[PDB]
Amino acid sequence: MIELRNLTKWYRRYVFRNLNFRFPDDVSIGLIGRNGAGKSTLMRLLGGIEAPNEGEVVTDVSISWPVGLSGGFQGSLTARENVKFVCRIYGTSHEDMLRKVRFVEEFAEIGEHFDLPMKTYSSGMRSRVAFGLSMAFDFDYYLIDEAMAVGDAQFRAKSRAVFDSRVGQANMILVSHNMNDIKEYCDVVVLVDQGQATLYEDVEAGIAAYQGSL
Amino acid sequence: LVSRLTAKRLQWALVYLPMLVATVYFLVFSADRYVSESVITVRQTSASREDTCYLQTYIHSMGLLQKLDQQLKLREHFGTPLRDPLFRLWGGTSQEWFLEYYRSRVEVLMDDICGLLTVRVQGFEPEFAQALNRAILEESERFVNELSHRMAREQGRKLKSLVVVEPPVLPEIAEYPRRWYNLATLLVVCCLIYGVVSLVVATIRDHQD
Amino acid sequence: VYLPMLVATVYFLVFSADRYVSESVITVRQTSASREDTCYLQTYIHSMGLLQKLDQQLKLREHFGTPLRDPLFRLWGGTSQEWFLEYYRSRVEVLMDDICGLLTVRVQGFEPEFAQALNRAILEESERFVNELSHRMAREQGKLKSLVVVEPPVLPEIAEYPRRWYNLATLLVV
Amino acid sequence: MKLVSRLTAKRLQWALVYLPMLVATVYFLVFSADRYVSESVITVRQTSSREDTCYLQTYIHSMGLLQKLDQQLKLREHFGTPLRDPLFRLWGGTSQEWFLEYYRSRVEVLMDDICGLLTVRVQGFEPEFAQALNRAILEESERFVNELSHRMALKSLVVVEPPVLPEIAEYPRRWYNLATLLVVCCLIYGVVSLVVATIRDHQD
Amino acid sequence: RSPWQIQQAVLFALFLRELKTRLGGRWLGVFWVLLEPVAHIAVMTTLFSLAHRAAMPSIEYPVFLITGLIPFFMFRGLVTRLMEAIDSNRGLFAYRQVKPIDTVIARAMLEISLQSIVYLIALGTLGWLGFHFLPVRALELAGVSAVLIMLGASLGLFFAVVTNEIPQARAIVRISLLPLYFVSGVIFPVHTIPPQYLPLLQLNPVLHLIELSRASFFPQYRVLQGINLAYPAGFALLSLFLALMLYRLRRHQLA
Amino acid sequence: MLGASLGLFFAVVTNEIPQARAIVRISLLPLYFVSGVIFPVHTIPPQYLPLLQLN
């Protein structure tokens, strides 16, 4: 149950100021809105990157951090030390992080030059290991922001396959621009503009909202 | 528990209790300590800094303390204030602790550029402090004269004297118990400590998610 | 900010009492090593026996309490001996020039005549103390050290230390 | 590899904190022996210098003086009496060098440059013996100075503070040493635990 | 989970990460850390051995220099390595569990461990060669070291908060750390200084801490006027309070 | 000419190494004290004279 209580966050335009909102339970919801209108601040606060100055967000279930964050990796360290660092932050057990690093190195398929720092690292394998790490953790609200995979057709194909395998028992959150995948997975929509948010049960009203207000 | 600490509990444990304890001790249970100050210097009569160094060492010695205790009964006097347990000389203590207490009560400072030895004697009565300072000065002069006498006799009349720039003054009010200054500085330190502790515990609680 | 200035100005221009200063410049010399006697004298000026002698000579306690509208620089009645000594040390300033070995004594006071008399009494008592301190070592076996006056005590005409305008400007800095 | 995982940090804190403090507390509160200290403060002058005081400082810690004192007061027999103490007891049948080192450890000589006064602190297992040994040291020092002056071809020892008779022991300080060892053991355990965690993480 | 176990896990993770990046290659930085003090001891002994011999006839130059230098290396590291602890790990503040002060305290802990290890091995080596290696007042030395550590960490946190957007400020304080190495009496004993410059040097807390640590280390070491622990203790406490208040104010401004 | 030559040499050498610029900026400060700028140099013990002749 994700609930908002009079949130206020200064970024001197007040992006979000002492409003309250409610969210559906066990319903696929994807954040949508105009770029730069406050959606980025809202999903960063949803992922716990920053805390609200006033008000709180409450949820009885843990929230996964947004996927595909290249900034979350230290340049001087390789993928193995970074994944063991983040899992130690999450406090996993011994065999737990052994399984997690095995899964992430199997998903990466970058066994050659696997222990290579992010300084001399290509964007493709960086995105691969980022998606593998973001998938390796067990959660039920995935804050997917940019794409699903980087590579050839089979890369995105098996990424979507495992995504459907792991999401079918859970809930998934999309903040993107294309609406084909939103129509394919998502059911309800929240639109944010200038600090006011509107909830649409059907995305058909969201199409008209984008055509008119944006 | 650490997570169950509140602001008022922190204020009571850190600030209020030491404040009450210090105020009660200083304003009720603290004993006055009058100070008698004298300024002396030893010079030949018939290399003086050597004699000043000898006097500085000899004042804080044990034989002088033995003579002073036999003469003025310092141990009986210093144990008189019962209401002050911190600064009283408890009966039945050790000789080493008695020497440490006497060295704490009597302060000796030296001006090398001027070559002047100042002695500040603490006591629980002004008359006793002045008498102790006078006895210390007399014994120091007698010790210097005795050393000169035995040094002259070893080869086989007062030759060295101790000038007194300032005789022991009889105090009127207590000096060293500074209740208000100590209370103010302890209050400032306590407020700083409480602020630091509260900031640290808030930083720790910031990781609640 | 305006209220402290108002109260300070009214106190300085209405309540503050004038304090006249008399200046003397001395040094001690063997008639027939001088730094030692000079430092003994410098310690002796701010001593307590000298203050006692001055008290039963000139009655400084009554003189320093004669003002009534200047509680900041007033010697209140019934004050302690230690506070009286601190007040006397504040009122009498002793400076030393080592490269010349000269001692400057500045004596404050609410009346120029009393300030000059106090400075002269200090000088004569210092000379007598030097003579007696030599004479005790002299006759322990059983007039040789004279204090010369480079500048004798002067009789001031106007007050010096209550610098009202300078202190007001210094307060305006803060 | 296996050895680092063998500690589990519980046997680690037991072997780096519990055992040393337990052993030290047992030794200090059960087997440690009192050592009364007598203090004297002397200097040398001519009966009519600094170099002579330095010669005295060197002579006090010498072997001829130790032989004289062992012949006189029987220091070797006395220092072996506290059989309970294994550390600060002079064992029987030791060498001359060990006896000299032990005597130099018991007797402490200090000198300051400003005042030029030499202070001697003599330890013992009895206050009377410590005072007697200090007095004997002073007497032999003044005799040595006088003999040196005589054989050179008129000096005296100025005793500012004569030797005192101690009332209680001061040097076997139990609580201060226990607190110091507690701080040292805590720091060592923290450093070792951090290092062993780092190597355990790095090895696999 | 409890709000304290998260802090412990994050601190351990950041300590391991920063130790990994600090030691280049297969731990090559430890050789550098070990070669700074021996090089310093060599040059300064070669220069002022006779100077210290003429200074005081009670202390040999190696031990005096090492106990005046290793605490200053402690303080200099705690000042320098702490301001860069915020900008270097700026990207890590996206995992809902890493806060700006966590990297700061991790860097402080690792600096403490490294310099304490160096002090221990160097003292053991000096004792092995035949020099004095046992402090006469260990508890007072520990208290002085703790006060110096707290002051250094407080200054580092304060500078990291203040100069977050001003790298040139970090540059000028890195410049000014060098004169502090000469005005703290680290190399030469401070009693051979004309008294007219004495009060101006009484405003430096590091000099007070160095002198008090040397007094607690060496026997019968004379302490001149105005070397009380009250002034550096108050300096450290006030600086720590100011740094914590400034971090609490500028808390959400670190990305 | 000496200053310009040193500046050009350092600019060429430390093009990719800012830390080199940092350490030479550090070491410029002792050069300010070992060049005799503040105090006259003839009041210096002769044993340190040849070592300072290399500056």
Numbering used by the authors:
A (entry chain A): 1 to 11, 17 to 219
B (entry chain G): 5 to 50, 71 to 180, 319 to 371
C (entry chain H): 19 to 50, 71 to 180, 320 to 351
D (entry chain F): 3 to 50, 72 to 176, 321 to 371
E (entry chain C): 14 to 268
F (entry chain D): 163 to 217
Quoted passage from the original study:
CPS secretion is mediated by an ABC transporter containing KpsT and KpsM as its nucleotide-binding domain (NBD) and transmembrane domain, respectively. The transporter partners with the periplasmic and inner-membrane-anchored KpsE subunit, a class-3 polysaccharide co-polymerase (PCP), as well as with KpsD, which is assumed to form an outer-membrane pore. The KpsMT transporter is surrounded by a cage of eight KpsE subunits extending about 80 Å into the periplasm. Cryo-electron microscopy analyses of the KpsMT–KpsE complex in six different states reveal a KpsE-encaged ABC transporter, rigid-body conformational rearrangements of KpsMT during ATP hydrolysis and recognition of a glycolipid inside a membrane-exposed electropositive canyon.
In a nucleotide-free state, our cryo-EM analyses resolve two apo KpsMT conformations (Apo 1 and Apo 2). Apo 1 shows well-separated NBDs with minimal interactions mediated by TM5 between the KpsM subunits. In this conformation, the gap between TM1 and TM5 of opposing KpsM protomers creates a deep electropositive canyon that extends from the NBD into the transmembrane segment.
